[PDB]
Amino acid sequence: SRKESYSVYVYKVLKQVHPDTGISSKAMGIMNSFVNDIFERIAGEASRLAHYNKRSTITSREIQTAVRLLLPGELAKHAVSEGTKAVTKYTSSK
Amino acid sequence: SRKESYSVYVYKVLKQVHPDTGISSKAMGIMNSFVNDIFERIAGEASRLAHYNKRSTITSREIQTAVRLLLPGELAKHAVSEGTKAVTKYTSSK
Amino acid sequence: KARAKAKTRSSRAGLQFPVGRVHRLLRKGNYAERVGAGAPVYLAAVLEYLTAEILELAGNAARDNKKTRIIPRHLQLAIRNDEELNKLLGKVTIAQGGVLPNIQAVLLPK
Amino acid sequence: KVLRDNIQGITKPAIRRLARRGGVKRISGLIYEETRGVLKVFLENVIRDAVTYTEHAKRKTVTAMDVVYALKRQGRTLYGFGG
Amino acid sequence: AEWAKERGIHLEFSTPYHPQSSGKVERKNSDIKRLLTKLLVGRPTKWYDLLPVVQLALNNTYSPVLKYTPHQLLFGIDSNTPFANQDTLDLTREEELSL
DNA sequence: GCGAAATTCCATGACACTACCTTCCCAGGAAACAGGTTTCACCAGCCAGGCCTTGAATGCAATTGTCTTACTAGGAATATTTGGACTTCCCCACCTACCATTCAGGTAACTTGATACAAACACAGCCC
DNA sequence: GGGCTGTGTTTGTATCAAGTTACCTGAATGGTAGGTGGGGAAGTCCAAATATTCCTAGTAAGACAATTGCATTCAAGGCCTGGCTGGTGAAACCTGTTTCCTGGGAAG
DNA sequence: ATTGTCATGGAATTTCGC
DNA sequence: ATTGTCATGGAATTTCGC
Ligand SMILES: [Mg+2]
């Protein structure tokens, strides 16, 4: 049937910073399974952040704390500020 | 307010195999926090067993597999058979 | 009007750890949406076997050092004396315990 | 509040006494500048993970379950204080 | 209130659950959200850029039933704005204060 | 005709899918905590002397590393044969959602009870 | 032969916990109705495991050569131990303040 | 190829008594 | 110990031309 994936959304990032670059099949699955794992670390730490503060709600604040825990040092400085651009751009729209 | 605990249910096990034995306050909290941790290992592996087999249901089969993973060797032989007694006794009742 | 005698589900299975309290910690912990009626029974038994097996071993070390009550040193020492109990808690620090008595038998005096 | 020279608070016998609990007979004099380094690495990976919990609930006090939640994150569980 | 007693501010509060009591501010908030609405058509709402515009675009809108600028009724003469009156430049400022 | 009583009139407002969210208040108490004083005892810092462990220099012995050859088995390609995971369709029992009822537990209090710690004198085990 | 530190045995009280309960509410149970989820039985197709040979590559082995590893001796440095001094850490005391701490409440 | 409304209390109105 | 409001387009109104 249908296997959902993140394979298509890699070519929309691979062709942003290296537009003359292909990527193999068996290397797609790593960047596929990199996403699904780094998804449920951030979600599965934001999930356990909901119980620790007695709320049933995953806000966009709780994903920010569950990225300042998993990412160390200098990735935790960029991937926070690479999200709050994509939210402030999002909320000024619609 | 109310802090739920497993402290009372230790005296109902401490006075089963050592009926002439007390237990201190700061040693209760270890056997308190032993329970809450060994709770969410078994639940939090039975939880992730629900997604791996695409069911929304925690059965009493899934707790049995999430005890044969966390407990090693000879504890995994007893704590399985110390549960299926307490289920077969339970289901023949009611 | 009145109703029947409320028989607790911990007494209907022969356990000591509750099943009423475990069954609301499988529906307020977001583990899944449906929780079977037999699952907090089966889980309160496995919480009850492993609570004995430490305190069985924690009773002996209290007795072997002439103590009435079990202080955490005994819980420190009941764990890591048993092999298979240690492999469960291999990553786990127990507070206020110290370690087992151990010398590598090379540091013995000459 | 600022109080410096307190990585030097881990004194010379109190690293030797920790060495004796590990089962160590003879030590060098250059572990003392190694232990204080490996210790402050371990507290810059717990307090950095503890404060992000306490800031998240907008608390000003890093409470007892916070540190246990930080040690839950690294895979070194601490019993006895809750959590 | 403890800051307000320093300045000589007489605080005045409306009757509760009665937004009609605060008169003009509920009107100009229907002006600010009809100026910033009109500027921001067809773009992302970056309205923090357009706030120095609003207290210069609304403050030089003629009251169409009073026929004056907010600038003239506050100060007395226009600043260097587009389409500013020269009809007051035929007068003396030392005497048009009491005009 | 006035008053009392029985009646018709009409101006109006609220119903439209609703909860959160923010900031300040209140509050009681308590949480300890951050702040600070106080004192005594102890643990850390100091320095040197003796000895033991480490490092180095070494000679040598076998261990190990390389070369070469006969070869065994691994892999691949094949056909096929066989063993099953998941998609499929349907029904029932089981979990849930609910209220009322009641029981049990947690807090809390007053008492009791029991053990561990601190101290002192002596004993035993191991080492110089 | 002697000595030192660890160890043990006995007592008293303070503290900690064990005890029993009072209530009161929270939660835990009982009885039910409903739907849904899952469990079960099936089938075509699917993926892996096998029986085969064939060839080839590297595995296995026998020989040899030289370095390394080991064991000893040498030389001294570094560290352990202890006799000493004192500066701080901790325990006991007091509190005001600050923060929380859910919880309730008002208002836009 | 669609559209307010209608319960509700002063208050005005009518009945009507003799 | 407080209270609507005011921009805005038909539409009515006034000016006024000669
Ligand atoms: Mg407002």
UniProtKB/Swiss-Prot annotation, chains A, B:
Cross-link (Glycyl lysine isopeptide (Lys-Gly) (interchain with G-Cter in ubiquitin)): K3, K89
UniProt modified residues of type N6-glutaryllysine: K3, K12, K15, K77, K85, K89
Residues that bear N6-acetyllysine: K54
Compartments, as annotated in UniProt: Nucleus; Chromosome
N6-malonyllysine, modified sites: K85
Domain of life: Eukaryota
A Gene Ontology BP annotation from the UniProt entry: innate immune response in mucosa
Modified residues annotated as N6-methylated lysine in this record: K85
Annotated positions of the N6-(beta-hydroxybutyryl)lysine modification: K3, K54, K85, K89
Coiled-coil region list: none
In-chain residues carrying the UniProt-annotated modification N6-crotonyllysine: K3
GO cellular component: cytosol; extracellular exosome; extracellular space; nucleoplasm; nucleosome; nucleus
Modified residue annotations for N6-succinyllysine: K3, K85, K89
Record-listed N6-methyllysine modification sites: K15, K77
Positions of post-translational Dimethylated arginine modification: R48
PTM notes: Monoubiquitination at Lys-3 (H2BK34Ub) by the MSL1/MSL2 dimer is required for histone H3 'Lys-4' (H3K4me) and 'Lys-79' (H3K79me) methylation and transcription activation at specific gene loci, such as HOXA9 and MEIS1 loci. Similarly, monoubiquitination at Lys-89 (H2BK120Ub) by the RNF20/40 complex gives a specific tag for epigenetic transcriptional activation and is also prerequisite for histone H3 'Lys-4' and 'Lys-79' methylation. It also functions cooperatively with the FACT dimer to stimulate elongation by RNA polymerase II.
Main subcellular localisation: nucleus
Positions carrying Phosphoserine: S5
Chain positions with PolyADP-ribosyl glutamic acid modification: E4
Residues bearing glycans: S81
One GO MF term attached to the UniProt entry: identical protein binding
Membrane spanning residue stretches: none
Modified residue annotations for N6,N6,N6-trimethyllysine: K54
PTM annotation (Omega-N-methylarginine): residues: R55, R61
Family label: Belongs to the histone H2B family.
Protein name (record): Histone H2B type 1-C/E/F/G/I
Naturally occurring in which organism (per UniProt): Homo sapiens (Human)
Organism classification: Eukaryota, Metazoa, Chordata, Craniata, Vertebrata
From Swiss-Prot, chain C:
N6-crotonyllysine PTM positions: K28, K110
Keyword check for Ubl conjugation: yes
Glycyl lysine isopeptide (Lys-Gly) (interchain with G-Cter in ubiquitin) crosslink residues: K5, K7
Ranges of Basic residues composition bias in the record: 1-10
N6-lactoyllysine modified-residue sites: K1
Record's subunit section: The nucleosome is a histone octamer containing two molecules each of H2A, H2B, H3 and H4 assembled in one H3-H4 heterotetramer and two H2A-H2B heterodimers. The octamer wraps approximately 147 bp of DNA. Interacts with VRK1; the interaction is mediated by the nucleosome acidic patch, a cluster of negatively charged residues of H2A and H2B forming a cleft within the nucleosome core.
Protein name, UniProt field: Histone H2A type 1
Originating organism: Homo sapiens
Origin organism lineage: Eukaryota, Metazoa, Chordata, Craniata, Vertebrata
Residues of the full protein shown: 10 to 119 of 130
Swiss-Prot record, chain D:
Outcome (variant: G75R): Found in a patient with a neurodevelopmental disorder; uncertain significance
Effect ascribed to mutating R21C: In TEBIVANED2 and TEBIVANED3; uncertain significance; does not affect early development when expressed in zebrafish embryos
Effect of K12R: Abolished ufmylation
Disulfide bonding pattern of the chain: none
Modified residues (N6-glutaryllysine): K12, K40, K58, K60, K72
Modified residues (Phosphothreonine): T61
Modified residues (N6-lactoyllysine): K12, K58, K72
Keywords: Acetylation, Chromosomal rearrangement, Chromosome, Citrullination, Disease variant, DNA-binding, Hydroxylation, Intellectual disability, Isopeptide bond, Methylation, Nucleosome core, Nucleus, Phosphoprotein, Ubl conjugation
Main location: nucleus
Residues with N6-succinyllysine modification: K12, K58, K60, K72
Residues annotated with Phosphotyrosine modification: Y32, Y69
Residues with the N6-methyllysine modification: K1
Cross-link named Glycyl lysine isopeptide (Lys-Gly) (interchain with G-Cter in ubiquitin), sites: K72
PTM note: Acetylated as part of spermatogenesis progression prior to histone-to-protamine exchange.
Modification N6-acetyllysine occurs at: K12, K72
Listed result of changing P13R: In TEBIVANED3; results in early developmental defects when expressed in zebrafish embryos
Residue list for modification N6-(2-hydroxyisobutyryl)lysine: K12, K25, K40, K58, K60, K72
Effect on the protein upon substituting K72E: In TEBIVANED2; results in severe early developmental defects when expressed in zebrafish embryos
Gene Ontology molecular function: any one: RNA binding
A single GO cellular-component term on record: CENP-A containing nucleosome
Cross-link Glycyl lysine isopeptide (Lys-Gly) (interchain with G-Cter in SUMO2): where in chain: K1, K12, K40, K60, K72
Subcellular location: Nucleus; Chromosome
UniProt similarity note: Belongs to the histone H4 family.
Name the record gives this protein: Histone H4
Source organism per UniProt: Homo sapiens
Parent-protein start and end of this portion: 21 to 103 of 103
UniProtKB/Swiss-Prot annotation, chain E:
Gene name in the database record: pol
Organism: Human spumaretrovirus
Top-rank taxon: Viruses
Subcellular localization: Virion; Host nucleus; Host cytoplasm
UniProt name for this protein: Integrase
Region of the whole protein represented: 947 to 1045 of 1143
